[PDB]
Structure 1
Amino acid sequence: SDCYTELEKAVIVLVENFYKYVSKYSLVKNKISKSSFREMLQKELNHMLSDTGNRKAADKLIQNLDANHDGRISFDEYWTLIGGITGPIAKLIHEQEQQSSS
């Protein structure tokens, strides 16, 4: 434990959910599905986003990614998915931290 940064832990928190989902949430020799991918991001980002309206922002990304017929989510293929969410609302994010308030 004991030495890793919170940035290290944050890159890790994005890999926790990757391995969680790729593995256990059906099958580890490989099942996933871009349906439950849209729910998983709604468990974990339950407060990041302002509405059903804001959902379409992630739904456009979720479309533009694994409409690819590989049956794989890859490490950075999972990242650009939510890195593309983290731009329009990322203005409010900075604001929260620079004011430290929430």
Structure 2
Amino acid sequence: SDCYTELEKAVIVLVENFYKYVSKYSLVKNKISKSSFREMLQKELNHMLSDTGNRKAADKLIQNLDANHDGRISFDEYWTLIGGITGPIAKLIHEQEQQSSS
């Protein structure tokens, strides 16, 4: 009796927040523009973004990925883009759930 850990439902929810944008197998034959990652990020990850710098740290990754990428999408592509925003604010996140020791 197992509850499904928050982390684990969350790895499910992150996998859906990406796979919603393809038809199940379709990583080349039906796919988004990589230019929607940086835009969908301003809808589904909106509460840490306002400074706009956190979004500039998405758009830097787009161009870095374009240089290497025909649009054979990889599952690893989206995951390695999220880690380029989740970084400068990453300390600040852990410190917001505390807020009592700067």
> For the superposition of Structure 1 and Structure 2, which TM-score range results when normalised by the shorter chain?
0.7 to 0.9
Structure 1 unaligned residues grouped into runs of 5+ = none
CA distance in 1, matches of 2:20, 2:2: 23
- Partner SS for 1:35: helix
Structure 2 unaligned residues grouped into runs of 5+ = none
Distance verdict in 2 for CA 1:88–1:64, change over 3 Å:
same
After superposition, the C-alpha distances for 1:26-51 in whole angstroms (9 at most, x for unaligned) are 99941210222221111111121232
Displacement, 1:89?
A: 0.5
Is the CA contact (8 Å cut-off) linking 1:66 and 1:73 kept in structure 2? no
Q: What TM-score do you get using the length of structure 2 for normalisation?
A: 0.78
Aligned-pair RMSD on alpha carbons? 3.5
The alignment covers a number of residue pairs equal to 102
Distance verdict in 2 for CA 1:44–1:24, change over 3 Å:
farther
After superposition, the C-alpha distances for 1:5-42 in whole angstroms (9 at most, x for unaligned) are 11111111110111101239999941210222221111
Distance verdict in 2 for CA 1:69–1:76, change over 3 Å:
closer
The percentage of aligned residue pairs carrying the same residue is: 100
Displacement, 1:53?
A: 3.1
Runs of 4+ displaced beyond 6 Å:
24-28
Is the CA contact (8 Å cut-off) linking 1:61 and 1:84 kept in structure 2? yes
Residue range with higher mean Cα deviation, 90-99 or 6-15? 90-99
CA distance in 1, matches of 2:27, 2:61: 24
Is the CA contact (8 Å cut-off) linking 1:22 and 1:31 kept in structure 2? yes
CA distance in 1, matches of 2:26, 2:89: 31
Q: What TM-score do you get using the length of structure 1 for normalisation?
A: 0.78
